[PDB]
Write an enzyme that holds these catalytic residues in place. Sequence first.
Site: not given
Length: 271
Positions: A26, A127
């Site tokens: 991530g 996103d």
Amino acid sequence: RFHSFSFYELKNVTNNFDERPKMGEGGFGVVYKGYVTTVAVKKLAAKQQFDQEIKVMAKCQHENLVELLGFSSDCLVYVYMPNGSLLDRLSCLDGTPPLSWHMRCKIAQGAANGINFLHENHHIHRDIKSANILLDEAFTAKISDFGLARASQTVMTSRIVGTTAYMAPEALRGEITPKSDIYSFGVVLLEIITGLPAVDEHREPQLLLDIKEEIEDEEKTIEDYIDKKMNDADSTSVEAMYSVASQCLHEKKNKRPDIKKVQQLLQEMTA
Ligand SMILES: CC(C)Oc1ccccc1C(N)=O
């Protein structure tokens, strides 16, 4: 509300936060596999995005959004998505079999239902990308990563965030609008149809969104771009999905369809 886990229970169940093939890498942390029930533990590494994730997940519970089970501070704990990201599945990472056209249609519909839920409840994701579309045990599409999400009108920011290959022109300039999420979804639909990632530094063109102009300039057709790793795709449904992507990828934000229209169109495609 949510479970409050001890740090050391999480440390334990994730083998002292081991990073050997760990599940994901991530933006502001590492995702570890845990057992408490199989879970995903996102341990944040180099603050504000932690509280935002909790705040968004508390308000947003839907069939097409990842579920947050709890948190830690002495870490974010979610429901385990056994089939990982759409990006990874489209690239057949680690030798997984290619997704059929049937599965891809279900995934696209599911993703559009998750985004619809977000926009319905006045949240801009900021996103939307195939790496942020996770897949459960039945390959149900679940939108993830809400650390950069914004509770929405039209506004501007000094800190421009997202993934360039997926971003809308106005997003790249600093505008915060749900219309940008639609553009990014259009890039994801191109990834689903073609099996090609949004950016490939060793490809001509490097950006997938440049294939829309090649198709439009009557040079090539969408048929030439259909993922060859499929045996169940049909012209009618592929063209219908491409038509939706095309509308999403309008350079002028106000000419794009809203998520409700996108959701309707994707349903009509399998009707
Ligand atoms: C929402 C994110 C942090 O969860 C994941 C991220 C990456 C790979 C798998 C998962 C999962 N849930 O299994």
